[PDB]
Amino acid sequence: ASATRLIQGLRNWASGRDLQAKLQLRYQEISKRTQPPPKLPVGPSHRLSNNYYCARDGRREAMPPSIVMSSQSEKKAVSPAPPIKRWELSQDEPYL
Amino acid sequence: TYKYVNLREPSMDMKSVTDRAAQTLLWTELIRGLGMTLSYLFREPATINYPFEKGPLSPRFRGEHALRRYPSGEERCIACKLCEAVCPAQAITIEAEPRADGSRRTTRYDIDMTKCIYCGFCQEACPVDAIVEGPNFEFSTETHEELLYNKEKLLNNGDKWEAEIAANIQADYLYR
Amino acid sequence: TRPTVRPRNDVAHKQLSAFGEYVAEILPKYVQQVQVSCFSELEICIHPDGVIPVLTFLRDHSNAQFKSLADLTAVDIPTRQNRFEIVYNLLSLRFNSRIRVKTYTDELTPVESSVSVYKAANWYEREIWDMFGVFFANHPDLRRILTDYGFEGHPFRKDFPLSGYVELRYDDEVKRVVAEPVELAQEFRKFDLNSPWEAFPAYRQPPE
Amino acid sequence: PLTLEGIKDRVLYVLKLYDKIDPEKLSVNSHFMKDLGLDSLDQVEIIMAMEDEFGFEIPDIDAEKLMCPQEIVDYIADKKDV
Amino acid sequence: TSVKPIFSRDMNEAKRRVRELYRAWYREVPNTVHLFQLDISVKQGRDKVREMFKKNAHVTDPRVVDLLVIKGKMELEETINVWKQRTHVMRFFHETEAPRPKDFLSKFYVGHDP
Amino acid sequence: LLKKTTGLVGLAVCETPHERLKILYTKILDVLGHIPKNAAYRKYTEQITNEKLSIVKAEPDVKKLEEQLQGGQIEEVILQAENELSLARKMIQWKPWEPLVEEPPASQWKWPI
Ligand code: SF4
Ligand code: SF4
């Protein structure tokens, strides 16, 4: 930021870009190293009623896997999913 | 939702053909590269003057370990071995016994600083904020066994850096 | 069960169960089990003589097109007589789906190499030779890939110790890096961490 | 390689340079396993010494059947003109 | 008891493969002592090859000796192509290791190992 | 319309995609007739190949055939037809409609142990 305008103009001409608007050295625009203390929120289960853990027990809703076939008509052939939809070209910048 | 990099069919009119041939014969993109290098020649470099200038750190920084004390001189470690159960490297070795007034205190608190992965699970597993991983990172030794800390070295790091460690914990503990 | 519980995907569960029935009935010569996990991943447990006919099916069939071999894995389970569990992970980019093809062998039975289906397997099953000791028949260049050159034993076997049997150091008498039987200045401390209370009643096995 | 006496003397010369065979029992009909008392790998390195001397490759199925110097010299005679 | 083989149908083809692997090692030993510039003799390395083949001589299973032949071909391939260094070849010769106590009394004197 | 490139490297443009797909589908059905009729592979592959052949016969345009064959470019549809043909020629030799060659042991797929 302390570059004199001759070297600053020479540098902007050599780069081809306005370099001073976007300096890669950091100055007083950045955050303070000392911040105020936060007050972090609590989650949704920080309640005093209707908060039984058996209604929010994720690990105990995991089931063993459903055995579809085990060795102890004119039905349709299936795929593992519907086929993938063809991707749309970018409206932003397709390079076209 | 996708784009085609390098799918430009160039123009074949005499304007663009002569532009590309002047670029070939007069080296336009090479002078563009020289211009970008010349542009960085006149920039102020990013070099800080170490050791006199220091790289910026945060209060969360995980450096050298330290066993802390309560604000009475009593050490915070109540010999509970959570920091060595959680230790991913098994760098912490703890042996304990009741001392002469009946307090649950360690006799062996070793950290192998050459096993340690400096990940700070010990300071976040510690229920009483005894072990912390302080802000010192400039503690290179000349010998391997000087990086094998016992309880005396860690309590001395606590007594050495407490004025900084307490302020870092003060700045960070509402995120913990 | 909204905020902290993973949402169940019933559509993908139904589609993968249907395609598992599809594969099980097209190839009944080798398909032994078909199962779908509660987080909707399809496993096709097959017989090890049908490694090539199943995988060439899923790679080439127009309702499967599993053109990608994502991963190839062995798992040592010593309580089985066929202790090694060879796991193929396959990706169909056409149908945006994944399948798992599982099979088994012991130390002495060879498995047929799947480089004829996925050339990607060329290193993976070679790693299965290096880490587990499973031999792959009709492999192009089967040798070690990760262990040291004079390394005895297959490390990811569960009877192989964590530290090995040997360790290296430089010795200035013979002017050479040498191997010696392993001695640790601090032993690895073994932690018995398992709680004696049952964690998941859905996975309870029936007693004797 | 011309004469059978030279081939027999040359077989015996290869066997007497081979140090494990006692030269007191080294005869033309001395069996390697049950007379001389050799390992199987001893017979294998004998056959490789014969390939060093005579200069042609002897396969496995026709070196397993070479249990005495007479079988070796008859093999070398049958694989050449003489 | 009906198992799928690796290469050999019985022990005779297995011993054939053992024997050809032994031939390949026996031919290779002088080249190995030369180009790794080992400080052993050729006879010492050939005695080590005979030792490594007699260590596994108690095996009667064709699949197990087929895997021993396969791993021996792998070690030979790591030897001929210079993939091992001198150190990996000399790890067969446990030269920095002190000799272990063999009888009861010296094992009693040194420690608790049986 | 003579699509300039397929976008996929190594996959060249097919000049006549319709006749190529018709030849590959009839060749798939001709090979697939040598599989027994009770096999599920023959039933399913005849079903999907008849669907694809009727869609190919029902559309003169190339791009509309690409949108309703639902397999991307027309050349990778052709490539999938070649792969299905090679697969069916292997399925005749493998004969995988046979019963299961060997049951697994009693706790072979029991997890956790
Ligand atoms: S440092 Fe903390 S976690 Fe570790 S034993 Fe002491 S009180 Fe427990
Ligand atoms: S930072 Fe991590 S590795 Fe280091 S002592 Fe703490 S828990 Fe162990």
DSSP C53-73: HHHHHHHH-TTT---EEEEEE
Experimental method: cryo-EM
Structure tokens at A15: 């780069």
Which chain C residues touch F84 with a CB distance below 8 Å? Answer: 60-62
Contact C110, C136 (CB under 8 A): yes
SS3 B67: strand
Q: Which of D9, D22, D39, D52 is catalytic?
A: D39
Structure tokens at B142: 């000349």
Instruction: Find the B83 Cα to ligand 2 centroid distance in Å.
Output: 8
Q: Which of A86, E38, C205 is CA-nearest to residue F7?
A: A86
Cβ pairs D/E, distance under 8 A: 17
C-interface mutation test, from E6, E55, E59, E91, most C Cβ less than 10 A away? E91
Contact C145, C127 (CB under 8 A): yes
Asked if F90's CB is within 8 angstroms of C56's CB, the reply is yes
Structure tokens at F39: 């096999």
Contact C73, C132 (CB under 8 A): no
Q: How would you list the strands of the sheet with B148-149, edge to edge?
A: B92-98, B104-112, B148-149
Structure tokens at F52: 């694809």
Quick check: CB of B121 below 6 Å from ligand 2?
Answer: yes
Q: How would you list the strands of the sheet with A66-70, edge to edge?
A: A66-70, C31-36, C42-46, C97-105, C84-92, C68-76
Q: Which of B2, A16, B18 is CA-nearest to residue B10?
A: B18
Paired strand residues for B132: B66
Structure tokens at E96: 């920095």
Q: Which residues line ligand 1 (CB under 6 A)?
A: B 77-83, 94, 125-126, 128, 130-131
* φ and ψ at residue B41, rounded to 5 degrees: -60, -35
Residue bearing tokens 């996708």: B2
SS3 C169: strand
Contact C54, C37 (CB under 8 A): no
C68/E110 Cα distance (integer angstroms): 59
Paired strand residues for B133: B65
Q: Looking at chain B, which subunits does it touch, using at least 3 CB pairs closer than 8 Å as the criterion?
A: A, C
What lies within 8 Å, CB to CB, of B11 at 6+ separation is B17
Which chain E residues touch D45 with a CB distance below 8 Å? Answer: 26
C79/C154 Cα distance (integer angstroms): 18
Contact A83, F71 (CB under 8 A): yes
Instruction: Return the DSSP state at F99.
Output: P
E23/E29 Cα distance (integer angstroms): 10
SS3 B58: coil
Contact B62, B119 (CB under 8 A): yes
Instruction: Return the DSSP state at B69.
Output: B
Q: Which of B99, B113, B106 is CA-nearest to residue B130?
A: B106
Residue bearing tokens 């890939």: C145
Closest C-alpha to ligand 1, atom 1: B131
F27/F30 Cα distance (integer angstroms): 5
Q: How many of the other CB atoms lie within 10 Å of CB of B37?
A: 11
SS3 C123: helix
The answer to whether residue D39 is catalytic is: yes
Burial pattern C55-89, b for ≥16 Cβ within 10 A else e, equals bbbbbbbbbbbbbebeebbbebbeebebbbbbbbb
The pairing of strands C42-46 and C97-105 is: parallel
Q: Given CB atoms, is E52 within the 8 Å cutoff of chain C?
A: no
SS3 C104: strand
Q: Given CB atoms, is E22 within the 8 Å cutoff of chain D?
A: yes
F83/C94 Cα distance (integer angstroms): 14
C150/B162 Cα distance (integer angstroms): 51
Contact C84, C134 (CB under 8 A): yes
SS3 C181: strand
Contact E38, E45 (CB under 8 A): yes
Amino acid type, D61? I
F-interface mutation test, from C26, C95, C105, most F Cβ less than 10 A away? C26
Interface of C with E (CB under 8 A): 107-110, 135, 137, 143-144, 148-150, 171, 173-174, 176-181
The DSSP H or E segment spanning F29 is helix F17-32
Query: Is the bond into F17 cis (omega within 30 degrees of 0)?
Result: no
Q: In Å, how far are A7, D23, D49, E13 from D37, measured between CA atoms?
A: 95, 13, 18, 24
A85/A80 Cα distance (integer angstroms): 14
**Which chain F residue lies closest to C33 (C-alpha atoms)?**
F109
* φ and ψ at residue C174, rounded to 5 degrees: -90, 0
Q: Which of F14, F80, F92, F30 is CA-nearest to residue F52?
A: F80
Q: In Å, how far are B117, C146, E35, E73 from E70, measured between CA atoms?
A: 40, 18, 24, 5
Helices (H) and strands (E) in chain D, counts: 3, 0
Q: Given CB atoms, is F55 within the 8 Å cutoff of chain C?
A: no
A7/A13 Cα distance (integer angstroms): 10
Instruction: Return the DSSP state at C201.
Output: G
Paired strand residues for C118: none
Amino acid type, F31? V
Structure tokens at A14: 């050599």
Contact C15, A70 (CB under 8 A): no
The DSSP H or E segment spanning C89 is strand C84-92
Q: Which of C33, C51, C53, C58 is CA-nearest to residue C43?
A: C33
**Which chain F residue lies closest to C84 (C-alpha atoms)?**
F108
* φ and ψ at residue C79, rounded to 5 degrees: -80, -10
CB half-sphere exposure, A83, CA atoms < 13 A: 15
Q: Given CB atoms, is A47 within the 8 Å cutoff of chain F?
A: no
Helices (H) and strands (E) in chain B, counts: 5, 5
Amino acid type, C43? E
Q: What is the largest CA-CA distance in chain B?
A: 97
Structure tokens at F113: 């142990």
Structure tokens at A84: 């993938």
**How close is the nearest chain A Cα to the Cα of B87, in Å?**
25
Paired strand residues for C76: C84
Contact F95, C29 (CB under 8 A): yes
Q: Which of E13, E61, F108 is CA-nearest to residue C109?
A: E61
Closest C-alpha to ligand 1, atom 2: B126
Q: Given CB atoms, is F104 within the 8 Å cutoff of chain A?
A: yes
Contact C68, C93 (CB under 8 A): yes
Residue bearing tokens 């030792």: E51
Q: Which of C188, C72, C184 is CA-nearest to residue C121?
A: C72
Residue bearing tokens 């007699």: E54
C118/C59 Cα distance (integer angstroms): 9
Q: In Å, how far are A3, A30, B54, E103 from B49, measured between CA atoms?
A: 19, 21, 7, 68
Q: In Å, how far are B61, C31, F31, F50, F84 from C60, measured between CA atoms?
A: 53, 17, 16, 18, 6
Quick check: CB of B133 below 6 Å from ligand 2?
Answer: yes
Amino acid type, C191? F
What lies within 8 Å, CB to CB, of B160 at 6+ separation is B66
Residue bearing tokens 């390195």: D45
**How close is the nearest chain C Cα to the Cα of E105, in Å?**
22
* φ and ψ at residue D3, rounded to 5 degrees: -100, 145
Quick check: CB of B118 below 6 Å from ligand 2?
Answer: yes
Annotated resolution, angstroms? 2.8
Asked if B2's CB is within 8 angstroms of A90's CB, the reply is yes
Paired strand residues for C178: C169
Helix boundaries (H) for chain B: 14-26, 28-41, 82-85, 121-125, 151-172
Residue of B68, B93, B94, B117 best suited for mutating to test ligand 2, as the one with most atoms within 8 Å of CB? B117
Closest C-alpha to ligand 2, atom 8: B87
Residue bearing tokens 């080798």: C30
Amino acid type, C109? T
D58/B15 Cα distance (integer angstroms): 78
A1/A19 Cα distance (integer angstroms): 10
Ligand 1 atom with minimal separation from the B82 CA: 3
Q: In Å, how far are B50, D54, E19, E23, E66 from D59, measured between CA atoms?
A: 73, 14, 11, 11, 19
In C93-150, the DSSP E strands lie at 97-105, 111-112, 136-137
SS3 F41: helix
C-interface mutation test, from A78, A86, A87, most C Cβ less than 10 A away? A78
Q: Looking at chain E, which subunits does it touch, using at least 3 CB pairs closer than 8 Å as the criterion?
A: C, D
D21/B158 Cα distance (integer angstroms): 77
Q: Show the CA angle centred on residue A48, arms to residues A43 and A49, nearest 5°.
A: 110
Instruction: Find the E79 Cα to ligand 2 centroid distance in Å.
Output: 42
Judged on CB neighbours under 10 Å (0-12, 13-18, 19+), B103 is exposed
CB half-sphere exposure, C118, CA atoms < 13 A: 23
CB half-sphere exposure, D48, CA atoms < 13 A: 16
Structure tokens at B166: 């307490």
* φ and ψ at residue A66, rounded to 5 degrees: -75, 115
Handedness of CA C5, C11, C12, C15 (dihedral sign): positive
SS3 C159: coil
Q: Which of E89, E84, E81, E72 is CA-nearest to residue C148?
A: E84
Burial pattern D58-68, b for ≥16 Cβ within 10 A else e, equals beeeebbebbb
Residue bearing tokens 């519907």: A82
Structure tokens at E114: 């049986």
Instruction: Find the B77 Cα to ligand 1 centroid distance in Å.
Output: 5
Structure tokens at F95: 């004969």
Q: In Å, how far are A16, B45, F3, F11 from B6, measured between CA atoms?
A: 23, 34, 18, 18
What lies within 8 Å, CB to CB, of C50 at 6+ separation is C27, C29, C30, C31, F96, F101
Structure tokens at B27: 């080296």
Q: Which of B106, B91, B101 is CA-nearest to residue B152?
A: B106
Judged on CB neighbours under 10 Å (0-12, 13-18, 19+), C171 is middle
Closest C-alpha to ligand 1, atom 3: B126
The pairing of strands C111-112 and C136-137 is: parallel
Amino acid type, A19? L
Q: In Å, how far are A44, A56, E44, F61 from C1, measured between CA atoms?
A: 11, 5, 73, 51
Q: Which of A78, C60, A91, A83 is CA-nearest to residue F67?
A: A83
SS3 B146: helix
Q: In Å, how far are A55, B72, B78, B87 from B96, measured between CA atoms?
A: 42, 22, 9, 18
Contact B71, B65 (CB under 8 A): no
Instruction: Return the DSSP state at A89.
Output: B
